[PDB]
Ligand binder design. Structure first.
Ligand SMILES: NC(=O)CC[C@H](N)C(=O)O
Ligand SMILES: NC(=O)CC[C@H](N)C(=O)O
Ligand SMILES: NC(=O)CC[C@H](N)C(=O)O
Ligand SMILES: NC(=O)CC[C@H](N)C(=O)O
Lengths: 230, 228, 231, 227
């Protein structure tokens, strides 16, 4: 998977996802920094918060490059807070809109890039899908996003092979983790981008080291380490 | 099919299509005034003009009632000019998003409710799909919406079994025809609705007589007959 | 939902599902004895056992009447044991192929017509989907189809409002429950049909009374009452 | 796009399309000899003739690798004559099952790998889709597969940039053209394969030169230049 998020002044979905020369659209068929998966063609999703702060989502199980409706409508959807993803399905996982990021508890939008043994996660009746990412999202939501770091560190310990890159937002805050995959940040004059990989070659892009938490709010970018549990 | 259109102050797609108690969503599984088709479950479409007058469209080949994305996003899409439809596919026609109304030439959005023998329509290289409605739209667009009435009257003469209900918009104007199916109008304080059937029991709803052209602008509604 | 099953001599999926005058295809837009749901257009599925006894499935989240591929290929798929369904999705449930019956554990194909509070079913890591039917299917598979009756009676006690019509097959046997919705049986000279609705006006159709178990194998059809639970 | 055809003893769709190590399934995400298109994820289709000579088709607008129904059912579908394809949609063309090869007139199945300007093709009321391949298929069907070579050379003259690789079958015969994309042939003991690219490294694979017609029937493979 690849994901991207925005927090700042109103910005269109198209401008964040479709229009950049190396953005999410391009990453659906030609990602630049993706170790696992050669493409992300098993669906996509775009979540945003409207002027009333309500979480809304558009999701699909088809390749992003092929969706004429999204290409037509995305430029007219503007938001101060966005989380979007393109999916590379793990073999054996369902391919269906409910399995595409972002997931939601109604307050937070959440994307997962990676892989985790569902066997180390609690069983749940509150997941949006059976895909490992959805089971993980349900866990994260149940513990609360203020405990994201602890949740990820604990799951990382239970499954040493897991990749646990999270990117989440609630309308006025971004939260992200690096845990076995890539993340970069870009400060703009009017807001902040977090992304699996830079959507262009802006010298402003800065890479987030592995096993860290990123916390974006009130024009602050707060980066803290995730300490292994033992 | 059933379609609906709005011209006026900004209105959300949800408020026009999903939220009314007998609106397009309800009509996808339980239309009230539809002689042909017991439902409209073969897709749907919503076209609108943004604040810059650009026509934009969201189309599907699935039942409207099942689309979680549209239900989630539609309340946040507001427009001064909307044309939306739910589809009942004629047996033998393809079911695919390209075949769902509204069609567009970039300037006009256009929906067709009815049926026409493609044999009486010109072959075209400008159709969005192979369905009869797309071939008809191509003809209408080619002749110009300024000649919508003449186009429909001519096609109606060539195919006397055809039903030719059109509903179209360009961002500042609505155009529609009744030709063998239903249409009604509702004048609101902040705009005008044209619809295959009323989306509630507002006593302001008024039915458009058959074989007529409807022209909506600047808070005017002009109804004229389609002559031979 | 509506479902249908066949156990007998080879029969094409088309002949069972598409071709009868009021069969599953017609039931997708115009069911004749369905109290809950106007139609069944939220997907469909056809499972069958091939000549090696392998369960195979074709499933969709689109209306059966519009699927040209299935209309074209179904006449060429023949089987001695078939379970097929058309779906009416409960509001709030996902609409996606994984949520369409039949579900499978590799040995059994299973369809559910009805509705159940997922809150009274065990958590599971073995469900195909989050839809209530998939969670119920997982429970049924886990307890074993030989305990189908007890499983359904127990769930029925836990959710007094639940409808729990099951139709299942393993290649050599059909199992079914009536629990708040319709089922009929037709014995042909070459096999047995179980179906939510008769697919024609054959005078051999007979209706299964509510709260009963149906067991078809070795050309026997055995119908037994299911006692309610009061634990 | 990439396509493959079989003419011979009964073969399962899975054995031809899904199971080979570099076959159509793999080509949907990792084609080996494809100049135009990184992959073929914009749909797929499998057409075959049943025991009574009836042409049947299963088509999709989704990536082949993700279709669980086809993966489950394909091993149970056997045929003496198959034409299958994975689609790489030209930008601006519709993505929908009717736009996926193979197209059919009821007697012939037909797949197109390439691109042609629809302006050089006659308008038609008999096309399955508005995609260029469907308009081209309608023309080819109208002129007759017996004139396949003439039609393709004619269209190629009108659109000098067109790529016009056709692969077609009627249950007892394969016909194919190379016109700006790849094709190979494998002769098996029990039949013949034509394919955009070899589905394995069988030493029997041989490549068809460009601007040629291939005609497979009665266990004979005849390759002739298009002039
Ligand atoms: N590559 C990934 O990020 C995969 C995410 C998750 N396992 C899925 O199948 O969707
Ligand atoms: N009932 C109708 O309005 C059918 C419209 C058109 N013939 C179609 O197939 O979509
Ligand atoms: N009416 C029914 O049979 C519904 C079955 C199940 N609740 C579903 O959503 O698929
Ligand atoms: N690359 C190709 O073969 C494209 C074929 C055809 N132009 C299509 O869009 O399907």
């Amino acid at each position: 998977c690849r994901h991207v998020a925005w927090l700042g002044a109103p910005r269109s979905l198209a401008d964040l996802v479709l229009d950049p020369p190396q953005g999410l659209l391009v990453q659906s068929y030609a990602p630049r920094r993706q170790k696992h998966g050669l493409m992300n063609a098993d669906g996509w999703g775009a979540g945003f918060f409207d002027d009333d702060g309500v979480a809304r989502r558009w999701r699909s199980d088809k390749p992003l490059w092929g969706d004429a409706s999204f290409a037509s409508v995305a430029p007219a959807l503007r938001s101060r807070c966005v989380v979007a993803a393109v999916r590379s399905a793990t073999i054996g996982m369902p391919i269906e809109p409910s399995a595409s990021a972002p997931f939601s508890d109604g307050q937070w939008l959440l994307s997962h890039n990676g892989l985790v043994d569902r066997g180390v996660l609690p069983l749940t009746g509150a997941a949006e899908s059976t895909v490992d990412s959805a089971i993980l999202a349900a866990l994260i939501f149940s513990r609360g996003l203020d405990a994201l770091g602890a949740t990820i560190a604990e799951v990382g310990e239970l499954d040493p092979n897991a990749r646990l890159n999270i990117l989440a937002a609630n309308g006025s805050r971004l939260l992200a983790t690096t845990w076995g995959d890539t993340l970069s940040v870009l400060r703009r004059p009017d807001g902040v981008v977090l992304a699996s990989e830079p959507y262009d070659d802006d010298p402003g892009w800065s890479d987030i080291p592995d096993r860290h938490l990123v916390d974006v709010r009130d024009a602050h970018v707060v980066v803290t380490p995730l300490l292994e549990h033992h």
